Amino acid sequence: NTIDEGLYSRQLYVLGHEAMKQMSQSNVLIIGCKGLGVEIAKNVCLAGVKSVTLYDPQPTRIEDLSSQYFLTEDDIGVPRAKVTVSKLAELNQYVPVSVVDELSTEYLKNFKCVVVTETSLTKQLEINDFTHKNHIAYIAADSRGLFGSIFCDFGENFICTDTDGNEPLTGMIASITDDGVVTMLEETRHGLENGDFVKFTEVKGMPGLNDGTPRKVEVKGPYTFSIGSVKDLGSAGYNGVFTQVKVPTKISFKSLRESLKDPEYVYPDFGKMMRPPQYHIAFQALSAFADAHEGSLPRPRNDIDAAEFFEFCKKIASTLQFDVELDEKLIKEISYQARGDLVAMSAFLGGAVAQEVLKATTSKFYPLKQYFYFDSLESLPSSVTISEETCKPRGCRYDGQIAVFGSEFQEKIASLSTFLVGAGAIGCEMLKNWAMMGVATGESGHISVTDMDSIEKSNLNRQFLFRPRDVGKLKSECASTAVSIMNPSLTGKITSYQERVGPESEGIFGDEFFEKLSLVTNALDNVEARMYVDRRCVFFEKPLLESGTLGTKGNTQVVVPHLTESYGSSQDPPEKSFPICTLKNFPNRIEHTIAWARDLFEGLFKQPIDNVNMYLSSPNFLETSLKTSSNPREVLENIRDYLVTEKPLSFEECIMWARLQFDKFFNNNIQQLLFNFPKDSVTSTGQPFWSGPKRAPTPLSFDIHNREHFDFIVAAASLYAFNYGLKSETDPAIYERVLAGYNPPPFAPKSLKSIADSLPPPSSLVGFRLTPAEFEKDDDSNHHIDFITAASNLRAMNYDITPADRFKTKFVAGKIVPAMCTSTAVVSGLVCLELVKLVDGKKKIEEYKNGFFNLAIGLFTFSDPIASPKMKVNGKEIDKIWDRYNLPDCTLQELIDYFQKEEGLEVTMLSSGVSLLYANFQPPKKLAERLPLKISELVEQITKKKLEPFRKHLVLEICCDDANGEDVEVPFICIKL
Amino acid sequence: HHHHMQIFVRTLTGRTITLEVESSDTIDNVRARIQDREGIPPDQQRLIFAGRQLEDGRTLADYNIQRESTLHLVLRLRGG
Amino acid sequence: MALKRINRELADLGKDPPSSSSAGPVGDDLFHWQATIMGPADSPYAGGVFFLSIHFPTDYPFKPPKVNFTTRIYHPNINSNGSICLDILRDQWSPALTISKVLLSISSLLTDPNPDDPLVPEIAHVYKTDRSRYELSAREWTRKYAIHG
Numbered sequence A: 001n002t003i004d005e006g007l008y009s010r011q012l013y014v015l016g017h018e019a020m021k022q023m024s025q026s027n028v029l030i031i032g033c034k035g036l037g038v039e040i041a042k043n044v045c046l047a048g049v050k051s052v053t054l055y056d057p058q059p060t061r062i063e064d065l066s067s068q069y070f071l072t073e074d075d076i077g078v079p080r081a082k083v084t085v086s087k088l089a090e091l092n093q094y095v096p097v098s099v100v101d102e103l104s105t106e107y108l109k110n111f112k113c114v115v116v117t118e119t120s121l122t123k124q125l126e127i128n129d130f131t132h133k134n135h136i137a138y139i140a141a142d143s144r145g146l147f148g149s150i151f152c153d154f155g156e157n158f159i160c161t162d163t164d165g166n167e168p169l170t171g172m173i174a175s176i177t178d179d180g181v182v183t184m185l186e187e188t189r190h191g192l193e194n195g196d197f198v199k200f201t202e203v204k205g206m207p208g209l210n211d212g213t214p215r216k217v218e219v220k221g222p223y224t225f226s227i228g229s230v231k232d233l234g235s236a237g238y239n240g241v242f243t244q245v246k247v248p249t250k251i252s253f254k255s256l257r258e259s260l261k262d263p264e265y266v267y268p269d270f271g272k273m274m275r276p277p278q279y280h281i282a283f284q285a286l287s288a289f290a291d292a293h294e295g296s297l298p299r300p301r302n303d304i305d306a307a308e309f310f311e312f313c314k315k316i317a318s319t320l321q322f323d324v325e326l327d328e329k330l331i332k333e334i335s336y337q338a339r340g341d342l343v344a345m346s347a348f349l350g351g352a353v354a355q356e357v358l359k360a361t362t363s364k365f366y367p368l369k370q371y372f373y374f375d376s377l378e379s380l381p382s383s384v385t386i387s388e389e390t391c392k393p394r395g396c397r398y399d400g401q402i403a404v405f406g407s408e409f410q411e412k413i414a415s416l417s418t419f420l421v422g423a424g425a426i427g428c429e430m431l432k433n434w435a436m437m438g439v440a441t442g443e444s445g446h447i448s449v450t451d452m453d454s455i456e457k458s459n460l461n462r463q464f465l466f467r468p469r470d471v472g473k474l475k476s477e478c479a480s481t482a483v484s485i486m487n488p489s490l491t492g493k494i495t496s497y498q499e500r501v502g503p504e505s506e507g508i509f510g511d512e513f514f515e516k517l518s519l520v521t522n523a524l525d526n527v528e529a530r531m532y533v534d535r536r537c538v539f540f541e542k543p544l545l546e547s548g549t550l551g552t553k554g555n556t557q558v559v560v561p562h563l564t565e566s567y568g569s570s571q572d573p574p575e576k577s578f579p580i581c582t583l584k585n586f587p588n589r590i591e592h593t594i595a596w597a598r599d600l601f602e603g604l605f606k607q608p609i610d611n612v613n614m615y616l617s618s619p620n621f622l623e624t625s626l627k628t629s630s631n632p633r634e635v636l637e638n639i640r641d642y643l644v645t646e647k648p649l650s651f652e653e654c655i656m657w658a659r660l661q662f663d664k665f666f667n668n669n670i671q672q673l674l675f676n677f678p679k680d681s682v683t684s685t686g687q688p689f690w691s692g693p694k695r696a697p698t699p700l701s702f703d704i705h706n707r708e709h710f711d712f713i714v715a716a717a718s719l720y721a722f723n724y725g726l727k728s729e730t731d732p733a734i735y736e737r738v739l740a741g742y743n744p745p746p747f748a749p750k751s752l753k754s755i756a757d758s759l760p761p762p763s764s765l766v767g768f769r770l771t772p773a774e775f776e777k778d779d780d781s782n783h784h785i786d787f788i789t790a791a792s793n794l795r796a797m798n799y800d801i802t803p804a805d806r807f808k809t810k811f812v813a814g815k816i817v818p819a820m821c822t823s824t825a826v827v828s829g830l831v832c833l834e835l836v837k838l839v840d841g842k843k844k845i846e847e848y849k850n851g852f853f854n855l856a857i858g859l860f861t862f863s864d865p866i867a868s869p870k871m872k873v874n875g876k877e878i879d880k881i882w883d884r885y886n887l888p889d890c891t892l893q894e895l896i897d898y899f900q901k902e903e904g905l906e907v908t909m910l911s912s913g914v915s916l917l918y919a920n921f922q923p924p925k926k927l928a929e930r931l932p933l934k935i936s937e938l939v940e941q942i943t944k945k946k947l948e949p950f951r952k953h954l955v956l957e958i959c960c961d962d963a964n965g966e967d968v969e970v971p972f973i974c975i976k977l
Numbered sequence B: 001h002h003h004h005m006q007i008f009v010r011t012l013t014g015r016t017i018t019l020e021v022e023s024s025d026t027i028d029n030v031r032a033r034i035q036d037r038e039g040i041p042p043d044q045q046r047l048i049f050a051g052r053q054l055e056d057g058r059t060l061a062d063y064n065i066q067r068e069s070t071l072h073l074v075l076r077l078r079g080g
Numbered sequence C: 001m002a003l004k005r006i007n008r009e010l011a012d013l014g015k016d017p018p019s020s021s022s023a024g025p026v027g028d029d030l031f032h033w034q035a036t037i038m039g040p041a042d043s044p045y046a047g048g049v050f051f052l053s054i055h056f057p058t059d060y061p062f063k064p065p066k067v068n069f070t071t072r073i074y075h076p077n078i079n080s081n082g083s084i085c086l087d088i089l090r091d092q093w094s095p096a097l098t099i100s101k102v103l104l105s106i107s108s109l110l111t112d113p114n115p116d117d118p119l120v121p122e123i124a125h126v127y128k129t130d131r132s133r134y135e136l137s138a139r140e141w142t143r144k145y146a147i148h149g
């Protein structure tokens, strides 16, 4: 029914209202409540399905705590599902959670989707046989050490209404030959693919295409493509617009039983194309092995079990006619790691499976079809002894991780000292992963987490360490407390900060702070902070684990000192922007009018206000602004208009003012534009001016009966009132009464000192200030989004552009980033699979992995990090990124001499931050007062600011010329003050 | 020696770009073509084949890129 | 490098033949430059000296610089805010281009306005229908704001 947008906001921008409605009517059953099952349950509970039912009568064992963060040592011996239920129930008040002690086939009909973990193949076959023929979605997954599997069967006639979540393709047409050869406008890519369906609109030449009947596309070029002979109607069309149509798709899934012999694989790594077939055999062998040992799996690093396990692999391989050789070393690892229970693997598979559950209950996004086999084998430690002896259980909560990494490695993890920047979505999952792993629980271990943000309602949907009662509290503090509960050993081992990592906090996070860190982990939502942290890690030579998400997408990057390039070493696409000329007078997309509207919001309820408060604040605002602003008149008129000319006394005067704005921005300006450029206008080339991107606009005649016109008056009037502290009203009657008596001032397309002195002296208004509107996208009652939506849609009407509703405008204007628990969980798992490589001190760059994925289409891909660039300086090989000169605080002259004398190079450029300290092209007079100065002194003077008392170093960038005048790259310089 | 082959470049959004190339082509050339087809600047192109990020100065052959080989064009995300 | 590239361009500006326009760091800030463009002799801007502000992005030259006019000017593609509609500043930008190239582009736009891609429709309209009226206004505006005090 009505979705709680306040709680689901970011997730709604990923799934959509319709998908979430179907979700709310879907019950889900989850078999298995160990690490994997609880992670799946957690994400499904946060997502908002109808209800979650758990089944797992197995008693809690100490090893289960290696990944099941809702179980405690006091629960040992108690059925897992029973212990877990109340914890999951607390996640989403909208999702009831319960336990069933027994299952029956007919009982399965109560669910839209059945998830099964920790279950033998024979039991799976029985379960799936029934679900497959009873229209019940089935998903099975298991976590086995550094190996994982996921199998999906959504029935033989599953319908998918959206296979990728991508917006439909659209573009402008130039001409359409009778043969069907369509051509986009000058330098315009249609982005279509063969097989896609597109309809048309505004096509001039064949009114038939504007019908709405989608046709098949036949791409011919990035600018041209064929749709078919359109000779029947029209000989040639032009100035049209195509729009892709996303037609539903039937996906036929085979049952588990019928696909065991010939499984369809989804490959997470194209560099390991040969493994899925090997793993398919292995996971079946584990189940056959368990059957011969009363459900027990092979023991950690136990050779006898692995040999028996390998025999099952041979038999199974033969039975399904596997014409490929079994990789004995690879396969036996699955036996050796069978009991391995890693929280990173549960996060990775758990988040991915949860997304599949949502695909089954919504018909949105392409499901995994059908077998997903994964490994992160490179995560296996090599700097420690991995044996039956080191991997054997110790009756410890980390036994699940020890089974894979050993007890020796357990100590390296426990002694880690970490820095987590950001306690949001990625932050919470990471903190939970660290807690289950035993990170920093050792004597020399520690965790420092910082974030300046406080908990908000929409955060709860994917920041599971927080609860509704925590809203308004600091994220870092709450998260720290939450994980101390998940793992008591972390009590007193965590320090939370409320600092924004960056330049202003270098006093707290300085040299001493960094020196003791083992590694830094980013969990940020902006590139600026990422670049800053990266720079600092390069300076302090500390490893950096980086990650990001966007909807169902995500990525991870690892930066290793003296081995890989750093985060800032590569380029990313720029943030979305639009041509200034397009926004000002020629919009053609709803994004263009929403940007225009945001600026209008600022230019009416913010910028003018600050000017009025600055005129009543500073002593010489007029004096300064007279030569500090790029348009003195605007600042003047703002003071005048907002203090006298247009100052409202009652709300009715606000309504009157709002009515005037309507004509100013949606009528008069449009008339003036049409006057300046008549609809019949032509270019200097002879072509019609108003074609393609330029859409001939139409002025709007105000009418209170048009909803958008009305919304604008209500929003604008209410915002204006906010500026003057006047109480606003919403009773439609008041507006009608006021608007009715409005006398539209005469308008016709036209073909400073006094304004200042006529202003009341600042001292004649001391104590009186206006309240500027501060853009806040998440408060639906402040009229902000209402104003931008209305303003944008009216301009949309002016240019004949399809309007967007408040929900969409809020997303565009508010720059909201699509997000959900699923992808958040997945990146955390991948990041922690890399973290263990750092702690093992791996030196080979190919052992590391940068990951990328899009859960909406079942796409995962990995690549080795890029080696840092090397270079030679006087024979010696230098690391362009990590190597640096460590010199004392000598004077400029001295530093120049050092390079000439030692490196035999001529210092041509020296800089500190963005400031140029020295250049071999500066005037002798200038260099005269600088050369004698010490670097520190030189910086303080040039930057016109004094260093801080905590400042212990200075970073400088330098450029040098080879003795032959040529240029030679050189590492940066660290000045030890 | 070298020879002709058809390769596929799939992006993170799921889109699939088909390319006709010669195993002798340099990674630099491929980036140039992708820029023409998609308008994406080479400096922003992160191409991966069989677990390796392709670097300039090498040829498709250097990465053992076969006929019908699929590569990935990915991006880094900033939320989370 | 980003800062080193801006420096290479700075150093190369002094190695170039005496040009009309001028540009360089503000207060030794390699990312915030001030430039001057002489009003072209063959235009109603002759005699005027036009100041511009230049902000280089952290990822320059992969991303174009933000160029803004700080001197008022009566022109079809430049508004009261200093904003400019010029191809090279957006979609026609590549790491190969430089500030010198940009300044020359801005100088060329001055002698040859582009009325078909108007930022200020009112001015472009005059340029198109009454060129002499535009030149008078352009010359007058140059006299009132581009001669400096």
Ligand SMILES: Nc1ncnc2c1ncn2[C@@H]1O[C@H](COP(=O)(O)OP(=O)(O)OP(=O)(O)O)[C@@H](O)[C@H]1O
Binding pocket: A010, A421, A422, A423, A424, A425, A426, A450, A451, A452, A453, A456, A458, A459, A475, A499, A500, A501, A502, A523, A524, A525, A526, A529, A817, B079, B080
């Ligand atoms: N420079 C910084 N130093 C420390 N933490 C930061 C910095 N910049 C951002 N963050 C934090 O990183 C986290 C980003 O996580 P996320 O995007 O999930 O949360 P959010 O910003 O609260 O959510 P939303 O974008 O939906 O409003 C936030 O908690 C944010 O305050």
Ligand SMILES: [Mg+2]
Binding pocket: A453, A454, A456
């Ligand atoms: Mg927030």
Ligand SMILES: [Mg+2]
Binding pocket: A525, A817, B080
């Ligand atoms: Mg955020």
